[PDB]
Ligand code: NA
């Protein structure tokens with residue numbers, strides 16, 4: 001329910017029933033042999049798991065310190081770690097007798113991931129998306145329609161992600177009998193933060209096993225970018241108990257901390273209730289965020305990261321638009337891997353951290369996705 | 383050098399030393415322990431091999447006939463099988479003491495794959511590309527420059543693939559001391575058709591093991607799309623001695639075979655010489671390579687590998703055509719039905735597999751090589767199909 005004081009289930013009574021039903025359904029299937037046989041089989045044959053753990057040899061020699069490994073989630077079907085979550089939540093919903101999936105999206109990336117999972121399982125999929133987001137993300141919207149999903153633009157208020165979230169809550173409230181709300185990150189009321197993190201944990205369990213095979217030891221640092229925080233928890237969570245591993249989350253520094261134009265909820269937001277959870281967001285009411293990485297452009301952050309920060313298990317830092325962009329070009333030229341701009345934040349801070357560390361130390365960076373979707377954006381910038 | 387009567391080494395005398403040195407190095411390293419260790423390590427950690435074999439249940443049942451499995455080359459780093467070849471050849475060139483990679487590309491996908499490999503190995507990369515093809519493929523070209531590669535537009539001839547290949551050939555002739563010419567399909571002068579096939583054979587080796595594991599027997603048919611024939615030879619080759627295994631190569635039918643606007647070299651082409659090989663080519667009454675059309679840019683290659691010409695002669699493999707209309711429907715169909723957006727080249731294979739399974743019985747099996755992912759083609763498909 002909670003992670004320290006963070007988390008919770010602060011929703012209108014109308015949503016309490018649907019949430020307990022989700023929580024009970026999850027408790028039953030989570031460890032179920034048959035449900036896990038279906039999920040591991042989709043992740044293998046359909047999604048491509050396991051993803052490799054890659055030694056960035058040339059980048060490492062260039063900077064001069066720590067060995068840099070990349071967890072290559074960029075190679076997941078769809079090009080983004082979000083697939084892991086969406087393909088876990090979709091079959092679950094079908095086991096509860098749901099014929100429909102809804103979800104909201106800002107950058108369009110969870111939109112794509114959900115439409116894909118829906119196509120696979122033959123469920124209807126409706127995606128809420130602010131009309132201003134729709135215009136900015138022409139290609140993700142087309143991807144969604146290609147996969148057979150309906151994209152409902154929201155043409156009220158600020159016409160942004162905040163307006164789309166609310167419209168999806170009102171929808172689910174009306175249609176939970178047959179509809180599952182497929183939340184995209186480790187946010188929202190219990191049990192979503194836990195469910196999402198459990199479905200992304202596969203990343204860390206593989207990474208863990210892959211670095212023991214390659215180096216004979218656990219890593220010294222694990223770096224990962226943080227929007228809501230699903231890829232970060234995914235890779236962090238199997239190492240939470242291992243005291244020797246530093247966990248570093250990298251939030252979107254945007255145009256700089258002092259400009260207002262960033263998405264550093266943990267580093268600069270205040271605690272509050274939002275989206276049915278107690279955590280950090282930028283604010284009284286939500287204030288707008290910004291990031292060149294569209295997936296990091298979300299006012300809030302996960303309550304389990306809020307917790308890890310409070311108890312100091314994990315450290316959180318920022319990287320600017322300019323820093324991520326240079327790391328986008330760096331990894332491309334030096335390793336032949338074009339990273340998602342979200343992932344480039346992690347890479348950019350890994351590059352800074354490596355410089356100050358010893359040649360015998362080890363950083364693993366969660367390369368949360370590939371850069372193909374971001375080519376237009378980088379072309380306007382450069 | 384030969385596959386029956388096709389293949390050969392039809393290049394100026396200047397290129398014969400370079401091609402002997404390449405053949406000598408390949409025979410030295412092909413079975414070398416360390417070379418294969420490093421190659422397999424890259425193919426695993428950098429490219430993401432193995433790729434899974436995926437059962438498309440929903441599609442199979444909708445059609446109501448033979449089983450359809452997709453070999454998921456769309457998941458390889460880069461989005462396409464091409465990477466398998468590029469990461470085979472680039473280290474080989476380095477071990478030969480070369481510091482520069484050059485390459486032809488028409489769709490831009492091979493040039494991207496070449497750029498990625500050169501970036502990894504820290505080699506210079508020059509990509510020759512038809513000026514008309516540069517204009518039609520702005521994101522693949524941006525990808526190449528992002529990767530550190532220089533792109534060199536070709537304004538000679540019809541400014542298409544054919545001309546890029548010749549300019550590539552002319553450059554290598556001058557610079558072969560330091561430059562390896564990274565040929566991107568099972569084409570070119572010997573030893574390239576053999577080499578490229580050998581580096582794509584991994585696909586069929588994985589598929590053979592995976593289908594045995596999944597079904598307890600070999601496939602009844604295997605379907606791959608054919609431009610130059612790289613991905614098809616890759617999946618075909620480890621099954622060629624398995625006599626019962628049908629092999630089907632699907633070529634671009636374009637607007638229709640009777641329209642001339644297509645790219646079906648094996649079905650409608652004549653025997654000729656181009657690119658330093660003897661194989662099948664699309665040409666007119668006066669011998670010149672005719673322009674090739676397909677909605678799938680990677681099947682614009684105006685000829686085909688000599689080994690496919692050989693397999694067609696001895697009727698080991700069958701070769702068919704599929705139209706733009708048909709491939710485009712398969713692209714939509716696979717996206718809705720399996721949530722996998724295929725490359726338009728691969729959608730040719732799927733389209734044929736969908737036609738073939740319907741006629742076959744429910745206990746027969748078809749492996750389709752899903753050669754690439756469709757992200758690169760979305761601008762094309764939105765223009766063709768429309769903004770829904
Ligand atoms: Na945030």
Ligand code: NA
Pocket residue numbers: 608609610633645646647648681683684685686
């Ligand atoms: Na052809």
